Amino acid sequence: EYPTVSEIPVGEVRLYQIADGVWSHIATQSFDGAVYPSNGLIVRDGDELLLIDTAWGAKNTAALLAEIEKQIGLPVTRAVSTHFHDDRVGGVDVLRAAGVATYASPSTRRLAEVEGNEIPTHSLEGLSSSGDAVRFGPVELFYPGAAHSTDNLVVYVPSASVLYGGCAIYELSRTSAGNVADADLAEWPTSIERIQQHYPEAQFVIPGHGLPGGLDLLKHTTNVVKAHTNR
Ligand SMILES: C[C@H](CS)C(=O)Nc1cccc(-c2nn[nH]n2)c1
Numbered sequence: 001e002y003p004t005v006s007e008i009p010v011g012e013v014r015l016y017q018i019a020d021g022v023w024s025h026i027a028t029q030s031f032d033g034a035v036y037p038s039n040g041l042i043v044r045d046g047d048e049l050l051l052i053d054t055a056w057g058a059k060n061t062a063a064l065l066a067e068i069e070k071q072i073g074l075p076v077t078r079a080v081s082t083h084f085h086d087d088r089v090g091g092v093d094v095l096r097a098a099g100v101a102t103y104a105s106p107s108t109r110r111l112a113e114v115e116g117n118e119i120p121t122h123s124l125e126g127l128s129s130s131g132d133a134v135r136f137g138p139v140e141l142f143y144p145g146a147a148h149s150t151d152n153l154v155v156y157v158p159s160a161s162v163l164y165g166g167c168a169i170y171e172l173s174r175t176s177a178g179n180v181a182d183a184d185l186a187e188w189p190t191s192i193e194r195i196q197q198h199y200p201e202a203q204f205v206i207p208g209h210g211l212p213g214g215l216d217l218l219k220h221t222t223n224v225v226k227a228h229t230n231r
């Protein structure tokens with residue numbers, strides 16, 4: 001079964017096989033007095049692994065690398081962070097120290113700088129305007145426009161029809177807004193339709209926090225954002 005928050009002590013990471021050569025990584029971390037689960041992606045890139053997002057902190061991210069080595073045994077050589085928050089860049093310094101080349105859009109890297117979070121080393125060019133998409137090894141990176149954050153990217157794995165929505169996408173059982181401190185509640189439903197229009201063939205949809213689902217997560221997320229807009 002997909003691991004839930006009460007099953008993962010903070011400091012431990014679980015790996016979950018989604019398809020051949022595609023895994024999600026699941027960690028847990030405290031935020032303002034409660035502990036939450038968090039998802040990331042791992043994609044086989046030939047003889048190497050491409051990591052999508054840290055495990056939300058340095059200690060969790062070290063546990064992630066240890067779990068990858070134990071269970072998969074290929075090197076993580078590249079990583080992309082999908083937004084500037086700590087569940088996506090927190091641990092980038094651990095990755096860099098372990099030899100991982102770290103990437104994020106230029107908007108993400110500057111927003112990370114400002115918030116005092118860790119900063120990916122390399123900039124992803126070609127994602128500066130909503131609707132833009134670029135190839136990055138075995139994945140496509142898509143900028144859907146502002147949503148959970150103004151700099152949020154989603155990640156598509158064509159080999160497997162896996163759509164990684166990151167924190168722009170809510171899981172089914174979440175019916176209220178999470179951290180919207182940095183969100184653009186007006187644009188958000190528009191960006192979701194863009195995702196829907198760019199990846200209608202998506203088979204698995206992974207939110208930034210919680211249980212994977214289908215393209216139904218897109219509709220559901222839009223409802224939650226709008227419910228919260230006239231609450
Ligand atoms: C740092 C990380 C960036 S998305 C984060 O805020 N995760 C996160 C995840 C799930 C819920 C909440 C939340 N906030 N208020 N009620 N629930 C926050």
Ligand SMILES: [Zn+2]
Pocket residue numbers: 083085148149167179
């Ligand atoms: Zn976030």
Ligand SMILES: [Zn+2]
Pocket residue numbers: 085087167208209
């Ligand atoms: Zn998040």
